Amino acid sequence: TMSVLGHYNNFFFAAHLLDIAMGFKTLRTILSSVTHNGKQLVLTVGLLAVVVYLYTVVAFNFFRKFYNKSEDGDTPDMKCDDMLTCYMFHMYVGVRAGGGIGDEIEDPAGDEYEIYRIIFDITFFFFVIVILLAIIQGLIIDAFG
Amino acid sequence: FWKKIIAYQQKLLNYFARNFYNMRMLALFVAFAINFILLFYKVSTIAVHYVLEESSGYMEPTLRILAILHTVISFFCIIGYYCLKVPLVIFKREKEVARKLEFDGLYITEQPSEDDIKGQWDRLVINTQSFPNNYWDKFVKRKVMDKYGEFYGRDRISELLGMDKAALDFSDAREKKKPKKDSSLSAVLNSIDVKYQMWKLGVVFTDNSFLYLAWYMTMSVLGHYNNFFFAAHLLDIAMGFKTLRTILSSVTHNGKQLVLTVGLLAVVVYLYTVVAFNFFRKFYNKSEDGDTPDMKCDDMLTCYMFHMYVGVRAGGGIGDEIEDPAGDEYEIYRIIFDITFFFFVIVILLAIIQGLIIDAFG
Amino acid sequence: ELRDQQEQVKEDMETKCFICGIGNDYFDTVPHGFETHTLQEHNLANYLFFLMYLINKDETEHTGQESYVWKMYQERCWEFFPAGDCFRKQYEDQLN
Amino acid sequence: ELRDQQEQVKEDMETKCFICGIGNDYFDTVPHGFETHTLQEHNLANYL
Amino acid sequence: VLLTNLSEHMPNDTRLQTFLELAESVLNYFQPFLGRIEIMGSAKRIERVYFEISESSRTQWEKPQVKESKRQFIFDVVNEGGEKEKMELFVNFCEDTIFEMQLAAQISESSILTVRSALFALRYNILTLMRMLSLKSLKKQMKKVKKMTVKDMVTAFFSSYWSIFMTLLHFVASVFRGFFRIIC
Numbered sequence A: 001t002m003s004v005l006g007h008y009n010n011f012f013f014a015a016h017l018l019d020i021a022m023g024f025k026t027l028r029t030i031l032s033s034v035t036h037n038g039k040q041l042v043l044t045v046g047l048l049a050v051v052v053y054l055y056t057v058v059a060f061n062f063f064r065k066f067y068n069k070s071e072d073g074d075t076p077d078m079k080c081d082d083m084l085t086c087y088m089f090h091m092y093v094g095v096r097a098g099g100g101i102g103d104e105i106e107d108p109a110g111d112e113y114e115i116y117r118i119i120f121d122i123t124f125f126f127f128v129i130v131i132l133l134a135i136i137q138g139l140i141i142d143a144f145g
Numbered sequence B: 001f002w003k004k005i006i007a008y009q010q011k012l013l014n015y016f017a018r019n020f021y022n023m024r025m026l027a028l029f030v031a032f033a034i035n036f037i038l039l040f041y042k043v044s045t046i047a048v049h050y051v052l053e054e055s056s057g058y059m060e061p062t063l064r065i066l067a068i069l070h071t072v073i074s075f076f077c078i079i080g081y082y083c084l085k086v087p088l089v090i091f092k093r094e095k096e097v098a099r100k101l102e103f104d105g106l107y108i109t110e111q112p113s114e115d116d117i118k119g120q121w122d123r124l125v126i127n128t129q130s131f132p133n134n135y136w137d138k139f140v141k142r143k144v145m146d147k148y149g150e151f152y153g154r155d156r157i158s159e160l161l162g163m164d165k166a167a168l169d170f171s172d173a174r175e176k177k178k179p180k181k182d183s184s185l186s187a188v189l190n191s192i193d194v195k196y197q198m199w200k201l202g203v204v205f206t207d208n209s210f211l212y213l214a215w216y217m218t219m220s221v222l223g224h225y226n227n228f229f230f231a232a233h234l235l236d237i238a239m240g241f242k243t244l245r246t247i248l249s250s251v252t253h254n255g256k257q258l259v260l261t262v263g264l265l266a267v268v269v270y271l272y273t274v275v276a277f278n279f280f281r282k283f284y285n286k287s288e289d290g291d292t293p294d295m296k297c298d299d300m301l302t303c304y305m306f307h308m309y310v311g312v313r314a315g316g317g318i319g320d321e322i323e324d325p326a327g328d329e330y331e332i333y334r335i336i337f338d339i340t341f342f343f344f345v346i347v348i349l350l351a352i353i354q355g356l357i358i359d360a361f362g
Numbered sequence C: 001e002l003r004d005q006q007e008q009v010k011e012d013m014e015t016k017c018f019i020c021g022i023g024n025d026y027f028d029t030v031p032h033g034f035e036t037h038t039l040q041e042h043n044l045a046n047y048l049f050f051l052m053y054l055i056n057k058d059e060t061e062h063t064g065q066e067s068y069v070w071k072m073y074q075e076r077c078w079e080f081f082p083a084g085d086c087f088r089k090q091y092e093d094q095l096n
Numbered sequence D: 001e002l003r004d005q006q007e008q009v010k011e012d013m014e015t016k017c018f019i020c021g022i023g024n025d026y027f028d029t030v031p032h033g034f035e036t037h038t039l040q041e042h043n044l045a046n047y048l
Numbered sequence E: 001v002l003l004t005n006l007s008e009h010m011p012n013d014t015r016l017q018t019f020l021e022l023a024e025s026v027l028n029y030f031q032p033f034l035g036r037i038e039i040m041g042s043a044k045r046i047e048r049v050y051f052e053i054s055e056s057s058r059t060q061w062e063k064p065q066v067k068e069s070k071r072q073f074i075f076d077v078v079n080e081g082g083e084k085e086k087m088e089l090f091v092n093f094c095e096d097t098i099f100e101m102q103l104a105a106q107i108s109e110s111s112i113l114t115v116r117s118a119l120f121a122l123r124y125n126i127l128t129l130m131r132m133l134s135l136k137s138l139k140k141q142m143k144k145v146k147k148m149t150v151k152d153m154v155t156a157f158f159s160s161y162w163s164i165f166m167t168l169l170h171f172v173a174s175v176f177r178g179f180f181r182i183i184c
Ligand SMILES: Nc1ncnc2c1ncn2[C@@H]1O[C@H](COP(=O)(O)OP(=O)(O)OP(=O)(O)O)[C@@H](O)[C@H]1O
Pocket: C013, C014, C016, C017, C018, C019, C038, C039, C042, C043, C044, C045, E067
């Protein structure tokens, strides 16, 4: 079916490059590391989503003023006024950020919630960026072993 | 009245004991539904209001019904625990105290070390008449009497164990018989054993799982005053799903080592902060404007906070965030400083955490 | 590697005697046999206590066995240490 | 895997003779029996 | 030592077993102090040697530092060592251990409040709950349950557990307050 659709649109022929997994036994050794603990990998992503949702709840309840993402003072692009928007911001930006959500939300210095937000950022970096990704790494390594 | 109350109480107890686990799973499902609903709040304007906005218009009454249902299910889970799991805890405690009393003389030869709350609290149940209430060996007091009655005195053993001396002999001897109905209210309120129930409630209160369920109930109640307290019930996935236990055991297997690694990282960063505060203060200006300098290492505490907060999370270390050292008389020293910070903190210690998790898996 | 080394240490200790080197399976024919052998007959703590006692004891007061062990310890010969043999293995026929 | 291979090599060498293949337990009935057998009777250096 | 030697060299003598039960007390008293090892005797045979272990020596042996040293020695010998030099390393370790044990004997010459607060909190808070039963005032409850109602019975059943949960909350609050009072 994909080969037939390739005539109507030639870029459908790229789906046939997914056949390397089912055609080459060498790639099976590499891919088995991913697939050996696939359930654990999915559960790790679910746990990461739950933890990030808890962090988003905390930020939405206490640290809303630190989620302006607009350089101009005329219009504020507040990213945590809506619960769904704040959760999307967290999952999309903070997880991919090297240092966590604190790398992307502005400076907390000279504020009455400074220590609380410092703890927030440090714990986000430690649990999400460091530990859960380490869990995925260890799952792959343990599958190899 | 009497058969009806006893039978119906037993029926409700049996129902809740049977359905304890199903209700515990239903609580988690309702918590996930409530949080999925909560994912659609908006702050509306000052006056700050958290308003549930929805196009359907049905989801706010649904949220209220779900919150009430979650509270009811949490109360029912507490009841089911008390009906089902508490008897096993009481049986284990009664068996352990009996074994220590008989084969160790925990209250005859030795005494509790005065810092064991369990050992000090188990004193009450010894004198009670409802001992092995759940444990099968109902001859434990007689066994203790036989074992320790000679060296330590029959009377003293009986006083410790709450056993009578002359009542049994008198009942064996001359006696008078008169039928009496137990259904008198004074009789039932005397038949209930106050001291043994007090000890039982103490054990239940000190039980960890009962405390966890009480915390669950308290959070569910607080969820009515503030709906975002229902997010704390999402922490129950760890204690409700066995699949997540395999993932979390990797973290918890070497938790002490992970904590010590963080402590060591803090000490190393403090040493680096000491060096920077003594020699590299001029490189910690964090203000783009020349009018006002935001010096981050003039104060020792400020410099340590800057290090721990920014340099550790930085990909390349503190040198990624403190300005260029080129064309300075401390250039080589600061280059060594930055490279060593990156190598020891960013590379090695994080590698230690990674290896701890991997080794826990293995 | 460190974890494997610790596991190997504990496995060796639990599977063979430190002194004679005989496996636990041989001693386990009698119930609790390995524990009895390693805690009553071939205890390294007992050997250390014997060395301490022999050193502290006067040479003139030594018995024949003590003098034998003392001479071989002075000459640094460790043949008195049982290797591959024990009381049970020697007296299998008489004991059981 | 490299560490496991080295450990397996040393374990094989210490547990069985290179030539005859008999285990060390059989030779260890006589004290230092395995060392005597592998250094005096079945030495691969002696065969070379 | 004589009796132990006789019993161990003749395990199947009932006449000697009788003397063993006769001397059970003395043998039990001297059990900690009786040393026992096996050696390759001069007669090309395994011989069993009985000696005296001193109380000071045993205490110095079960000192924790000596135990850590023993664990380190065993780890080192098992990991990096050969069976040919095992009995030489063991004798060296024994000599060093004996020296440090003798030196230690030479030099050695002549929260409760937090637990009690938690126990008092349990006692007080449980007595508060038992006071309702001790009042013997449930005649009013009996009068109102003269009418046999499933709703009333279920309400009482839930109310008892709700009271237990409230008592637990009070107990936790009391424990926390006592903790702050103690730390302050
Ligand atoms: N010759 C031996 N002497 C003592 N133990 C031996 C000997 N040979 C093997 N073992 C084993 O070593 C164990 C004792 O070793 P170890 O010192 O580690 O004891 P432990 O129970 O872990 O604690 P502790 O450190 O307090 O002695 C014995 O139970 C036995 O299994």
